[PDB]
Symmetry: C2
Subunit: 217 residues, 2 copies
């Protein structure tokens, strides 16, 4: 079956794993461990990095038959396209595209402070700006059941991840937005999602790699 | 006509401007000027940020009729979709998706060092890794006329922008890869591209905003 390679971390693979499960895709995972101490040994990966036939060697990666894909969003689309989880109407496609990139932005933004040694200093400012960002997601969603519209698309998996990451980070952030809270519920309530969430496959943490000041383990 | 809003800078709009021209799209540009001095005044934008009706207010933005799009790749896909410039075969679509993300990666990496005050220290290391990055683009293109395959797609506008940027930065970088040199030649050769490159509309630089240590002006 398909093989998903990534660190034994949640990181950028969370949405992919969720999507694979929601779609009944048969896959195996090649987990790569990183070294502890000051020598964050990545050799387990580096030593194999150029032996997989990947055009642009990177983690995560998905190998399906003759297709070797890298870059999160690319893998997400690859799978989504196989199950019609990309927009149908132009309007839907537009919303997918905007979000696909927007979520990647918000994700990296968080990533930058949790890897920066001076995390403690940056944290406050981040927390100040957080309500405005979250607000935007709320207003975008409005009263529809899913971000692209009336049907779940691969982006809901991305949005969910970003939201879940922030509730972990600052537990109270979603409170002022019942809109998002309901969304999270609708998502985790999906038969396949909850079924996966109660298995030994579920890897909700560590959030980031060993070399992070927050979310590591 | 569609209106493209951005700083009066090359930045992330370059590929967009190129795509618009190559496709005959009728558009206008709303250029926002940034302040100099230590008070990098962005009020020109801020004062208007929430008056355009964008879901996720940002630069650049494209406003076509009732469609308001933000995020570079969204704008690019929007225009590309309108003119069949996204992949056709599955294989073409995969290459598009990988490259749409890879180029954005490489773009951001360069950006980070050119905005960081310690640009001088960082430059050498960047230059050391550069030949490897470029090599990957070369091997991926191979003997094909365009990155996606036999037909030009929106990604070529993206790949070109990155290559061009690195040629501006480190003039000799492409030399070891005639593959890429030719590609740039083919691209700049396209009737509409050359026509545009010789107009007053062409805006090859500044590369980055007034607050960058390299590529500013």
């Amino acid at each position: 079956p398909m093989i998903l390679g990534y660190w034994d971390i949640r990181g950028l693979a969370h949405a992919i794993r969720l999507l694979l499960e929601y779609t009944d895709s048969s896959y195996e995972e090649k987990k790569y461990t990183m070294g502890d101490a000051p020598d964050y040994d990545r050799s387990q990966w580096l030593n194999e990095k150029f032996k997989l036939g990947l055009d642009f060697p990177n983690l995560p990666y998905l190998i399906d038959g003759a297709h070797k894909i890298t870059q999160s969003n690319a893998i997400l689309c690859y799978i989504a396209r196989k199950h019609n989880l990309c927009g149908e109407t132009e309007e839907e496609k537009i919303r997918v595209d905007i979000l696909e990139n927007q979520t990647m932005d918000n994700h990296m933004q968080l990533g930058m402070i949790c890897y920066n040694p001076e995390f403690e200093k940056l944290k406050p400012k981040y927390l100040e700006e957080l309500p405005e960002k979250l607000k935007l997601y709320s207003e975008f969603l409005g009263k529809r059941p899913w971000f692209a519209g009336n049907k779940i698309t691969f982006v809901d998996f991305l949005v969910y991840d970003v939201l879940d990451l922030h509730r972990i980070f600052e537990p109270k952030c979603l409170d002022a937005f019942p809109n998002l809270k309901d969304f999270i519920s609708r998502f985790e309530g999906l038969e396949k999602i909850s079924a996966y969430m109660k298995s030994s496959r579920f890897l909700p943490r560590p959030v980031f790699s060993k070399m992070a000041v927050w979310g590591n383990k």
